[PDB]
CSV table of C-alpha atoms in Angstrom, one decimal:
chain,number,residue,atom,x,y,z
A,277,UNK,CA,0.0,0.0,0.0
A,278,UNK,CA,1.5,3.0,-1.4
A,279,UNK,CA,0.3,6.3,0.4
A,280,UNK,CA,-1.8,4.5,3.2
A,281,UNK,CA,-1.2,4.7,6.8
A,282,UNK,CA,-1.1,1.8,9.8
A,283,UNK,CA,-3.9,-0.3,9.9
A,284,UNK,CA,-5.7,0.4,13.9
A,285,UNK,CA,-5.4,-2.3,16.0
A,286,UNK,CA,-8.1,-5.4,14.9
A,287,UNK,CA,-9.7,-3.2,12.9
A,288,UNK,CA,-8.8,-5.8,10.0
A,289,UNK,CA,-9.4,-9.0,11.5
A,290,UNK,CA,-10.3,-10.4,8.0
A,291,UNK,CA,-6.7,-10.1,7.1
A,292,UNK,CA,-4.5,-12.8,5.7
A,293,UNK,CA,-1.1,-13.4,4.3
A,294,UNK,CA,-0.5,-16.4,2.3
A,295,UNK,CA,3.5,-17.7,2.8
A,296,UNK,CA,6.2,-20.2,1.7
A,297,UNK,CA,8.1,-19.5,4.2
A,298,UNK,CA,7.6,-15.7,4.1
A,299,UNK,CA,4.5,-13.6,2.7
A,300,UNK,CA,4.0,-13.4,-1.0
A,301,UNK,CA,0.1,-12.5,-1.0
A,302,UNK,CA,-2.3,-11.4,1.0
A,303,UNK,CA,-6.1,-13.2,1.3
A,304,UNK,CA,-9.1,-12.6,3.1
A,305,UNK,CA,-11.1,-14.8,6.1
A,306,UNK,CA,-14.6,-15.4,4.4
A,307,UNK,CA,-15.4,-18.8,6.6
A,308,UNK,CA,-13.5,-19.9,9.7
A,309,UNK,CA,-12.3,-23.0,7.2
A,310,UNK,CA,-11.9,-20.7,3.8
A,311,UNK,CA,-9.9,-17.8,2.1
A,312,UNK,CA,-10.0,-15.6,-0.4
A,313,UNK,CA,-7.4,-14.9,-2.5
A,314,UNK,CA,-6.2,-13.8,-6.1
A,315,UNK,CA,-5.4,-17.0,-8.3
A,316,UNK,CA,-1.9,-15.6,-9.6
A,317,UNK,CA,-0.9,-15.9,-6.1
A,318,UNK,CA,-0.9,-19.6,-6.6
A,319,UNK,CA,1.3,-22.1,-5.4
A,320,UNK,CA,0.9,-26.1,-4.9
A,321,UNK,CA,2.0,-25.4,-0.9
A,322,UNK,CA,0.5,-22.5,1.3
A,323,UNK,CA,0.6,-21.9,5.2
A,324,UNK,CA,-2.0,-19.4,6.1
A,325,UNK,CA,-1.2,-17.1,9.2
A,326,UNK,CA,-4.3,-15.4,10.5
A,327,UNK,CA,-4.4,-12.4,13.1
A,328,UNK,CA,-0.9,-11.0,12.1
A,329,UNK,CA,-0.5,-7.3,12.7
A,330,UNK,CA,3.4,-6.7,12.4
A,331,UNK,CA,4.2,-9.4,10.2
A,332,UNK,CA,7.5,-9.7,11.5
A,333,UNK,CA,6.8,-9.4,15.5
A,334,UNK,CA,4.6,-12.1,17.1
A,335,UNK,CA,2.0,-10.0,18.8
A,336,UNK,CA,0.2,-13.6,20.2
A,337,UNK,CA,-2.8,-14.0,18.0
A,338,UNK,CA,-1.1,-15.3,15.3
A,339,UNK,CA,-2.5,-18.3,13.7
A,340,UNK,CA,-0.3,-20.5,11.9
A,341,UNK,CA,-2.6,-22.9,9.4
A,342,UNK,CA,-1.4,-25.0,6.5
A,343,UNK,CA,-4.0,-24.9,3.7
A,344,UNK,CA,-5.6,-28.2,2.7
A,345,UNK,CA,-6.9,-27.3,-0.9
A,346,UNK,CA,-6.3,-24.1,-3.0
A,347,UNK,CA,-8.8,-24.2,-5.5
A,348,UNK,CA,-7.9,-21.1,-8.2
A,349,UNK,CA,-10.8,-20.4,-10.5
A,350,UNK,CA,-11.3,-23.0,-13.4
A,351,UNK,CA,-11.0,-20.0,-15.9
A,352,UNK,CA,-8.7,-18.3,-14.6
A,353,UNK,CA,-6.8,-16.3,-17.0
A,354,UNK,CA,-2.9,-15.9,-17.0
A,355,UNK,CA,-2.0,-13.4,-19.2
A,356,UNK,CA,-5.3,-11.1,-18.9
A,357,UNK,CA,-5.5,-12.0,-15.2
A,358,UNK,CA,-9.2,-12.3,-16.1
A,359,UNK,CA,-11.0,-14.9,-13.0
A,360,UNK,CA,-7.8,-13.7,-10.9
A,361,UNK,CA,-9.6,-15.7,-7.8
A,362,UNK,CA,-8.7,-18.3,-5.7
A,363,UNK,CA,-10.5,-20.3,-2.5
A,364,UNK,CA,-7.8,-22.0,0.1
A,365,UNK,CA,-9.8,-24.2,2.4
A,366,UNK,CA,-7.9,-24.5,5.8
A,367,UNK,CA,-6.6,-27.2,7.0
A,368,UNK,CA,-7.8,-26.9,10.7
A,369,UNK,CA,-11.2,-24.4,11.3
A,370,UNK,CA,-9.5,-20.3,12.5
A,371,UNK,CA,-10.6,-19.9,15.9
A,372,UNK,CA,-12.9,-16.6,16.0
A,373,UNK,CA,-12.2,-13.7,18.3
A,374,UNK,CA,-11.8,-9.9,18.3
A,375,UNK,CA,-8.7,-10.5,16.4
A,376,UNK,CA,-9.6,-13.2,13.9
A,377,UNK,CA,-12.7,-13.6,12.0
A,378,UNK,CA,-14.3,-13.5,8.5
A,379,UNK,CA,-15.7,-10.7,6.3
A,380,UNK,CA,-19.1,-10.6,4.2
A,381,UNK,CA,-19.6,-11.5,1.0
A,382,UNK,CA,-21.5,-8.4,-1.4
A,383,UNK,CA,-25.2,-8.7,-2.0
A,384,UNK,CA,-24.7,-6.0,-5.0
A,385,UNK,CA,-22.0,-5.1,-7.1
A,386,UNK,CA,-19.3,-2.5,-6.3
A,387,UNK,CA,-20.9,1.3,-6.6
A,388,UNK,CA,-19.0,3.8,-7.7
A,389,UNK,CA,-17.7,6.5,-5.6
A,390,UNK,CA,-18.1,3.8,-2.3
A,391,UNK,CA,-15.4,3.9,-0.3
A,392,UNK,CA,-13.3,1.0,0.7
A,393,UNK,CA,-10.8,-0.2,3.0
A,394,UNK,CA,-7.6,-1.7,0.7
A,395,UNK,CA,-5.0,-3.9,3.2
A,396,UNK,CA,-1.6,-5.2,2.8
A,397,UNK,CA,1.9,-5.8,3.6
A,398,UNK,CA,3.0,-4.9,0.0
A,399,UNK,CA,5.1,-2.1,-1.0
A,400,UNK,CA,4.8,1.7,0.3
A,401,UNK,CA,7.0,3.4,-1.9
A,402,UNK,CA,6.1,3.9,-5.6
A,403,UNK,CA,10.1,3.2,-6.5
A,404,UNK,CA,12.0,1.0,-4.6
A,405,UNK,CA,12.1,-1.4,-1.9
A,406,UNK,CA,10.1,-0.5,1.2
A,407,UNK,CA,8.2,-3.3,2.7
A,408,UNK,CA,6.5,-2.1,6.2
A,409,UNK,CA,6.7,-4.2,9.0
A,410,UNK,CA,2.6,-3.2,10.2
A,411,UNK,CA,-0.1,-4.2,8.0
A,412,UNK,CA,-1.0,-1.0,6.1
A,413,UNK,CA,-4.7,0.4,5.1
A,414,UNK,CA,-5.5,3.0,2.5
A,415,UNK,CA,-9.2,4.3,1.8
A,416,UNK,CA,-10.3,4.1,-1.4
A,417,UNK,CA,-13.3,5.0,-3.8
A,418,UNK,CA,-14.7,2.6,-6.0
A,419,UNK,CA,-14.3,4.2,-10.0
A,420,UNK,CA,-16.5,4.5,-13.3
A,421,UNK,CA,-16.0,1.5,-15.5
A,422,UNK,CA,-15.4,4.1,-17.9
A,423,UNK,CA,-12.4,5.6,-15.9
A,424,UNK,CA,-11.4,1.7,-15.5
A,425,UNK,CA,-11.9,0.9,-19.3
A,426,UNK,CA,-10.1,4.3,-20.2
A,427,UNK,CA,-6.9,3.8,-18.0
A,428,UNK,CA,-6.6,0.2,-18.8
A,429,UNK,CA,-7.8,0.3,-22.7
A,430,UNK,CA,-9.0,-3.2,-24.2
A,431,UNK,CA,-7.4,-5.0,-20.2
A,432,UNK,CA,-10.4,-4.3,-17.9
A,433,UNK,CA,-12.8,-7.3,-18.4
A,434,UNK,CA,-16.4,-7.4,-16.5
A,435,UNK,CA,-14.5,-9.3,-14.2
A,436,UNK,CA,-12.6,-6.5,-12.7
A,437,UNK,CA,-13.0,-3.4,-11.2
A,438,UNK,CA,-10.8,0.2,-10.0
A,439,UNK,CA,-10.9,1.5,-6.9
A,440,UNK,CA,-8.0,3.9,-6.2
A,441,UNK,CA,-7.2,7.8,-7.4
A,442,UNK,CA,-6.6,9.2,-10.9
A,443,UNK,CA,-4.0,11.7,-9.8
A,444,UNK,CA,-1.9,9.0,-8.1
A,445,UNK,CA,-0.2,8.9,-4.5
A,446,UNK,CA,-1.7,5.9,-3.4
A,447,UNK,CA,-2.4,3.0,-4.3
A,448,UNK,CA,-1.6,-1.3,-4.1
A,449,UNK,CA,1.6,-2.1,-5.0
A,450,UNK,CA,4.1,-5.5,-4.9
A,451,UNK,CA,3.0,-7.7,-2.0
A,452,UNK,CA,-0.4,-6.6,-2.1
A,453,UNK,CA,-2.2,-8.9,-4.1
A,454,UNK,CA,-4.8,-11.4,-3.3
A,455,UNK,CA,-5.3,-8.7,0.0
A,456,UNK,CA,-9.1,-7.4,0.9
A,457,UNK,CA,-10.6,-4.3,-0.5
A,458,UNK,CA,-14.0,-4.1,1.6
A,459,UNK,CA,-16.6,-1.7,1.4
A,460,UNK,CA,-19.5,-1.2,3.5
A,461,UNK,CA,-19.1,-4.3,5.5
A,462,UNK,CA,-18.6,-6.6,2.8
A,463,UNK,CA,-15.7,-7.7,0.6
A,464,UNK,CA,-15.9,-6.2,-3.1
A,465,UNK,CA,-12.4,-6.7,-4.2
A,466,UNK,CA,-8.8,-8.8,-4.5
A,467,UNK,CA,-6.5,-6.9,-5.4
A,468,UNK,CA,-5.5,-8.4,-8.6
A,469,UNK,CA,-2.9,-6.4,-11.0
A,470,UNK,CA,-1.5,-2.5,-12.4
A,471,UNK,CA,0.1,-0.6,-14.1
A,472,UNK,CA,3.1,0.4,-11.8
A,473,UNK,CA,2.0,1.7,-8.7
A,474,UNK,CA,0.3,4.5,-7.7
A,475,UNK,CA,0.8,6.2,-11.4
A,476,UNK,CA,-0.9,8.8,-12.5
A,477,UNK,CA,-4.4,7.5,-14.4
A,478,UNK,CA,-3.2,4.0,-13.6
A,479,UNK,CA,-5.5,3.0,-10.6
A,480,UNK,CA,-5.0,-0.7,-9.4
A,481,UNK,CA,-7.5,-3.3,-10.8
A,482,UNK,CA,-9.0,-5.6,-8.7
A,483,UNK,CA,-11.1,-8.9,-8.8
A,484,UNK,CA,-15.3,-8.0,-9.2
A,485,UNK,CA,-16.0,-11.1,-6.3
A,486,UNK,CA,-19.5,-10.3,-6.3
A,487,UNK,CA,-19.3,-12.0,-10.1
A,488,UNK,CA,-18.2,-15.0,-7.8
A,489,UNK,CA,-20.6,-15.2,-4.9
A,490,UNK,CA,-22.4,-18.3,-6.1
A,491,UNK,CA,-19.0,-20.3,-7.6
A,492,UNK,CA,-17.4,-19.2,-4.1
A,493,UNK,CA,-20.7,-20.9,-1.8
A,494,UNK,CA,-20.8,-23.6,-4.2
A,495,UNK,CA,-17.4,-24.7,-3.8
A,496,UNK,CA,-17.6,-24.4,-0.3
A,497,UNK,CA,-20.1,-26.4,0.0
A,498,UNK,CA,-19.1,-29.2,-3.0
A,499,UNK,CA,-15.6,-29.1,-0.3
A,500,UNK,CA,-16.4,-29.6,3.3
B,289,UNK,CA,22.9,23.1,-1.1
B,290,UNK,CA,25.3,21.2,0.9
B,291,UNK,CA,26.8,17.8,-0.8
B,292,UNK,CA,25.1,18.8,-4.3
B,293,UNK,CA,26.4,19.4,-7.9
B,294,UNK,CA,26.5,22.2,-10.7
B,295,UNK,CA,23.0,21.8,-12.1
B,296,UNK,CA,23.2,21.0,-16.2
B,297,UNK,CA,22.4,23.5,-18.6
B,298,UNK,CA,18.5,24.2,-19.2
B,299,UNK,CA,17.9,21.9,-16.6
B,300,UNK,CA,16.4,24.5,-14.2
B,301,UNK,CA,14.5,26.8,-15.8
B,302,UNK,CA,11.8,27.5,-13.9
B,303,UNK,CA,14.5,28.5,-11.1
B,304,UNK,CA,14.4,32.7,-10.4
B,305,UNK,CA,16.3,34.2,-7.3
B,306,UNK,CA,15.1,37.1,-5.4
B,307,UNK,CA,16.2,40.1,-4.7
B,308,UNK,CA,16.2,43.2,-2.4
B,309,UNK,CA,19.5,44.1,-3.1
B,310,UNK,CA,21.3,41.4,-2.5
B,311,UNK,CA,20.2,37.4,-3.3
B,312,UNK,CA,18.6,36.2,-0.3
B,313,UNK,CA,16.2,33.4,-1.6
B,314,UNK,CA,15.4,31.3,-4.7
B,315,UNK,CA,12.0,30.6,-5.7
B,316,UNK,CA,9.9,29.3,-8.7
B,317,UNK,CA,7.9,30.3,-12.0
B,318,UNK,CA,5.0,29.1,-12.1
B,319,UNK,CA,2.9,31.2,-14.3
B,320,UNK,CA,4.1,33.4,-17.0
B,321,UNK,CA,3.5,36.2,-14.2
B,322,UNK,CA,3.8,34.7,-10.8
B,323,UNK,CA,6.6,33.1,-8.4
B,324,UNK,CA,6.2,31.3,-5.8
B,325,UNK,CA,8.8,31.2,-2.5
B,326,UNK,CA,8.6,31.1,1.4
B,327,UNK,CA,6.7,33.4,3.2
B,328,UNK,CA,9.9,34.3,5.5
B,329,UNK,CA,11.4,35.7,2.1
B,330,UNK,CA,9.3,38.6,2.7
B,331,UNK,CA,10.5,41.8,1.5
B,332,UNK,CA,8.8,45.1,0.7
B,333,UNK,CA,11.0,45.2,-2.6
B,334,UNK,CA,12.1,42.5,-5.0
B,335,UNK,CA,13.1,42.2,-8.2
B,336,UNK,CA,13.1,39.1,-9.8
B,337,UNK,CA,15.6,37.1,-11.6
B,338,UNK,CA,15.3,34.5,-14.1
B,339,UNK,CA,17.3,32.7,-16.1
B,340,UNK,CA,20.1,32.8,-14.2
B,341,UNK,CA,22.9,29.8,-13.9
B,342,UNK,CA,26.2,31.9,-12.8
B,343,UNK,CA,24.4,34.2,-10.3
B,344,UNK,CA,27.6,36.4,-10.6
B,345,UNK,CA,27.9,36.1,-14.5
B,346,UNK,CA,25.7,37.1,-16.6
B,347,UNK,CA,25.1,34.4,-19.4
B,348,UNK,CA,22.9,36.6,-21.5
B,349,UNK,CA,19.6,35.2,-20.8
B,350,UNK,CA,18.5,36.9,-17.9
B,351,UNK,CA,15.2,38.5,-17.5
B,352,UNK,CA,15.4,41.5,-14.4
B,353,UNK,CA,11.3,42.0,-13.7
B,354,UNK,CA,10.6,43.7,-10.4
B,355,UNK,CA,7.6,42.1,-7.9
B,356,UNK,CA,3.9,44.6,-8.7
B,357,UNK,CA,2.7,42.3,-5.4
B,358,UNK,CA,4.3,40.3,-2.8
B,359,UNK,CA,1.4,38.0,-1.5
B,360,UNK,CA,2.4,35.8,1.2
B,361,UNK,CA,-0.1,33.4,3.1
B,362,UNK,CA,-2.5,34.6,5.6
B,363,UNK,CA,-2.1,32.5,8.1
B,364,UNK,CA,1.9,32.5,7.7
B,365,UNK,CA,3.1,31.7,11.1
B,366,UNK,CA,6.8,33.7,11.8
B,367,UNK,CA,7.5,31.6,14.9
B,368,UNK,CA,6.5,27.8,13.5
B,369,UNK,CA,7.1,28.9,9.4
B,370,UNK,CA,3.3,27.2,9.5
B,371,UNK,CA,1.9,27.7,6.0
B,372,UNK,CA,6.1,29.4,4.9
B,373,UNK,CA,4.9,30.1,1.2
B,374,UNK,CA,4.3,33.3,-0.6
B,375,UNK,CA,3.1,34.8,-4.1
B,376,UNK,CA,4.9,37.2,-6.5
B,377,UNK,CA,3.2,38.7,-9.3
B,378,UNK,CA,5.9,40.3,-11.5
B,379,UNK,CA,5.2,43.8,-13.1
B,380,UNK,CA,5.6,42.3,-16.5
B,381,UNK,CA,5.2,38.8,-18.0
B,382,UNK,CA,8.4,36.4,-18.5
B,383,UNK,CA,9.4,36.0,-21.8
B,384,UNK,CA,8.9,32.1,-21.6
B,385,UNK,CA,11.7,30.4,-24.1
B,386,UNK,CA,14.0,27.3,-23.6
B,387,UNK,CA,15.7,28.8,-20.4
B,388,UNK,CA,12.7,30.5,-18.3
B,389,UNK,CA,10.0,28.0,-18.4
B,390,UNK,CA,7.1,27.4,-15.8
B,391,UNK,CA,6.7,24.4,-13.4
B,392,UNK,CA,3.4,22.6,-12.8
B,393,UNK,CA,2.1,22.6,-9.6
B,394,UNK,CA,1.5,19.1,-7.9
B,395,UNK,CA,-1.7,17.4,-8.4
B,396,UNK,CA,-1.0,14.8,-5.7
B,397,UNK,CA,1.3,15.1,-2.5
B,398,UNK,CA,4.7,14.0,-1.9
B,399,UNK,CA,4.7,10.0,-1.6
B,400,UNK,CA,7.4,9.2,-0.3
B,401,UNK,CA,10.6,7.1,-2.3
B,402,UNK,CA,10.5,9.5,-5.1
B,403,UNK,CA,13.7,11.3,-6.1
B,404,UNK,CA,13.1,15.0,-6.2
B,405,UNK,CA,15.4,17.5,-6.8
B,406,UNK,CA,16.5,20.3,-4.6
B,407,UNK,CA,18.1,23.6,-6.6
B,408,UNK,CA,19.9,27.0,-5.2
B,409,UNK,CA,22.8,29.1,-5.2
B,410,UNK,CA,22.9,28.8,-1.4
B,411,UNK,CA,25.6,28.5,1.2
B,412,UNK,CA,27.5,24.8,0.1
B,413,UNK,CA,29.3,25.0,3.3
B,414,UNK,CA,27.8,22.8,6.4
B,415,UNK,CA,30.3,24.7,8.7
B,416,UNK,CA,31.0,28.4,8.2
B,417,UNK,CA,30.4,30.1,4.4
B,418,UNK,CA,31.1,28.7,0.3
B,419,UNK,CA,28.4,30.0,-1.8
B,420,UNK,CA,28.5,29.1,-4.9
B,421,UNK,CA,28.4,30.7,-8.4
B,422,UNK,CA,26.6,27.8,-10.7
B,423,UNK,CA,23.4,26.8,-9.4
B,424,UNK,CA,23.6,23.5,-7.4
B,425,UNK,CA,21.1,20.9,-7.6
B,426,UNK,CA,20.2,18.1,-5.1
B,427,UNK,CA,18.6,14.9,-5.8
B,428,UNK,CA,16.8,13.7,-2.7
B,429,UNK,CA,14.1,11.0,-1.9
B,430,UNK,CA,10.7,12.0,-0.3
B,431,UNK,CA,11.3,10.6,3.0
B,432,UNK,CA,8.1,9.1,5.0
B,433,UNK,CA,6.3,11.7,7.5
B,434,UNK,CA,7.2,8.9,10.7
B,435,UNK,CA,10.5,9.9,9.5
B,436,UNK,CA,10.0,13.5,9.2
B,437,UNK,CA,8.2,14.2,12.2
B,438,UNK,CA,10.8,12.1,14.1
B,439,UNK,CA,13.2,14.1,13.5
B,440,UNK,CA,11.8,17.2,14.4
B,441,UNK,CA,9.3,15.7,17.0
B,442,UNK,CA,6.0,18.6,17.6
B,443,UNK,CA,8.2,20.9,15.0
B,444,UNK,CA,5.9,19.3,11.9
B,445,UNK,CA,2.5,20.3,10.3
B,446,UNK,CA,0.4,18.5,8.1
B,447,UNK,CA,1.5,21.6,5.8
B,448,UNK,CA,5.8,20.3,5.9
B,449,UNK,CA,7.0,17.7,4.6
B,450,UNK,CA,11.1,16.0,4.8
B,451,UNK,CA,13.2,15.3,2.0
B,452,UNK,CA,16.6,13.8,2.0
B,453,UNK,CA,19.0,12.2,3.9
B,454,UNK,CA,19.4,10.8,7.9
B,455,UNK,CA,22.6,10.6,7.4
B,456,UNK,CA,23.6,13.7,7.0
B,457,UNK,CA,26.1,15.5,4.0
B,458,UNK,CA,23.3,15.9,1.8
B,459,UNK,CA,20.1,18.7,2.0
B,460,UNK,CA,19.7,22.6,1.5
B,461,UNK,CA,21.5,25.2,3.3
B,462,UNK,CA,20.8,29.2,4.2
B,463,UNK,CA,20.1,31.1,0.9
B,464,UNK,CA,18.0,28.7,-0.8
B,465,UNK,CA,15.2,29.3,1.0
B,466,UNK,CA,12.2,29.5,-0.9
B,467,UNK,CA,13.8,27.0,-3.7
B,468,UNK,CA,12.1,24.6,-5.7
B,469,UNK,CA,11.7,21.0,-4.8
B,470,UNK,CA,10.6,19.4,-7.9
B,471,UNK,CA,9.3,15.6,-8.2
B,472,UNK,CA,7.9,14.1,-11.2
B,473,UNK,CA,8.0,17.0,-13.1
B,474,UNK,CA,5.9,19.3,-10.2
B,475,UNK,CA,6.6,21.5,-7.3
B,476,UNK,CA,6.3,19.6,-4.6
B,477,UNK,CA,8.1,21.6,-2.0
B,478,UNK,CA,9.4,25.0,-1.0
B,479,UNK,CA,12.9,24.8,0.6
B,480,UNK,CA,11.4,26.4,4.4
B,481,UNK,CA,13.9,25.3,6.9
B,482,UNK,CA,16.1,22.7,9.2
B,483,UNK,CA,18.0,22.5,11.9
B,484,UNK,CA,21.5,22.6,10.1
B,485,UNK,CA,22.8,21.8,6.9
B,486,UNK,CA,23.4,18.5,5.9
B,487,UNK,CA,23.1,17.8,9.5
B,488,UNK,CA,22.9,14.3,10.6
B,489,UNK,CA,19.2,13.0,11.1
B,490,UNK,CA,18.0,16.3,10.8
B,491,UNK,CA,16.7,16.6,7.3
B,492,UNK,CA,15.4,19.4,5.1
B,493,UNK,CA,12.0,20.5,5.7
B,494,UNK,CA,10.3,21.6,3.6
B,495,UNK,CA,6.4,23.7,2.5
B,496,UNK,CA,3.6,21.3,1.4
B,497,UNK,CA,3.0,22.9,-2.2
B,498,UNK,CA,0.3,20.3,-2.2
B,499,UNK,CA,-2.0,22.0,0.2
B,500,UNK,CA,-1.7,25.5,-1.1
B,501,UNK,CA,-3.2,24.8,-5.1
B,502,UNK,CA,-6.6,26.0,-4.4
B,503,UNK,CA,-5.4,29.0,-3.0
B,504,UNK,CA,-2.6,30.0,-5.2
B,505,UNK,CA,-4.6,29.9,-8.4
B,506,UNK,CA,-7.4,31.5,-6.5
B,507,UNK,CA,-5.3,34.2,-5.5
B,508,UNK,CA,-3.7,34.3,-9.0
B,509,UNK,CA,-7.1,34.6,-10.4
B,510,UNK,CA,-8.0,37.4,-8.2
B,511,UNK,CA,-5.4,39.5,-8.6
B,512,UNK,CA,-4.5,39.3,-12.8
């Protein structure tokens, strides 16, 4: 997260980071057995660590799960990142407290001008190497398709949506992806791909779940 | 500009110096018409200089326009330099070729990581007095406001910002006050003030251009 600022304490119990041995992605706690996360963030072996605050500094509600099944979307789309979505089921069921627990899934589509909460140990500069130790938060409005369309010409599918600032400043960068972008209580986005980050007219692009909602409770359900 | 270099040719051109009688302070073109520079450069009488590399040579494509009004900030605060920026309108309109050119003004704030680059014909000297003749330019990195406000702990507003080095042997330096900071190609910052040159975790800081674009082009507007 380019231009955000530290995350309060729990107010993003949702969070995730997905690891092989450190953090690649982030993810999302939609079930106390399942995650959301972005499908290029794929690997064959995941660990799950839930309630992490300063991802480098046990704080004591860490939760250290192994996943049991990462299921990336069956049309998922490498080069277009179109379907850029990805279920891990947990090994073990999170325990649930003030510092752990799930986020909603949207009843309605993303409405412009909404504004959501974007989380993530990923980058904070736009140009170099700075990785912050606490997880960091950014508010953000959801876009126009148009604007989306316009930046991104002939990339943004139905499938994805911007949320972010046409000027710049801040935005998701590296080590953000497969993270949370939640708006009025309920998940709307994974951050999915960009053009550079935090570039002028170059908002980040991020996975439309609600386009998922059924698949997402289906295979849920099809896998416990 | 302590630990800096002679600035290439055309490479400054929206650079001007004031003037009341002596060179006190740098500042900026940003309008055919108008400079911008700290509000502590106040003087009743300025004249303007532009296009000026050798500030003790003439080159030939100087431009000696005298301030018609010297507008600094309202709420310019002498003791904290709180809102340290000020407006010149010059009595006649710069002849804008490749030499004296404008700068844009920022449409989004200083994120931090981004090289910007510092320019004066102030003191080079950290201890005691070498002023140079070329103009000296800087390249510095906007450094994150934890950072900044560290350093000068309760000194900070929401209307400063740092740039440079903790180290030390790198930032501006008495005379180029009211200098350009210029990122991406906009005015970020005005060079305000520190707490000694080049001095060792206590970086250049320097006035938020950002928050000041409503007002400047309001007060340009109101007074053309």
């Amino acid at each position: 997260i380019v231009g955000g600022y530290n995350c309060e304490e729990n107010s993003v119990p949702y969070q995730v980071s997905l690891n092989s041995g450190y953090h690649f992605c982030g993810g999302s706690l939609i079930n106390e057995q399942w995650v959301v996360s972005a499908g290029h963030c794929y690997k064959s072996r995941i660990q799950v660590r839930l309630g992490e605050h300063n991802i480098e500094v046990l704080e004591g509600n860490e939760q250290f799960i192994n996943a049991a099944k990462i299921i990336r979307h069956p049309q998922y789309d490498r080069k277009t990142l179109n379907n850029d979505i990805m279920l891990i089921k947990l090994s073990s069921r999170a325990v649930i407290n003030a510092r752990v627990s799930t986020i909603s899934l949207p009843t309605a589509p993303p409405a412009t001008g909404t504004k959501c909460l974007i989380s993530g140990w990923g980058n904070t500069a736009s140009s170099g190497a700075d990785y912050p130790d606490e997880l960091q938060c950014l508010d953000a409005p959801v876009l126009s398709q148009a604007k989306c369309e316009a930046s991104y010409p002939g990339k943004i599918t139905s499938n994805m949506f911007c949320v972010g600032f046409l000027e710049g400043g801040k935005d998701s960068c590296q080590g953000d992806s497969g993270g949370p972008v939640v708006c009025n209580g309920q998940l709307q986005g994974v951050v999915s791909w960009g053009d550079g980050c935090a570039q002028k007219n170059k908002p980040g692009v991020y996975t439309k779940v609600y386009n998922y909602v059924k698949w997402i409770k289906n295979t849920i359900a099809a896998n416990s």
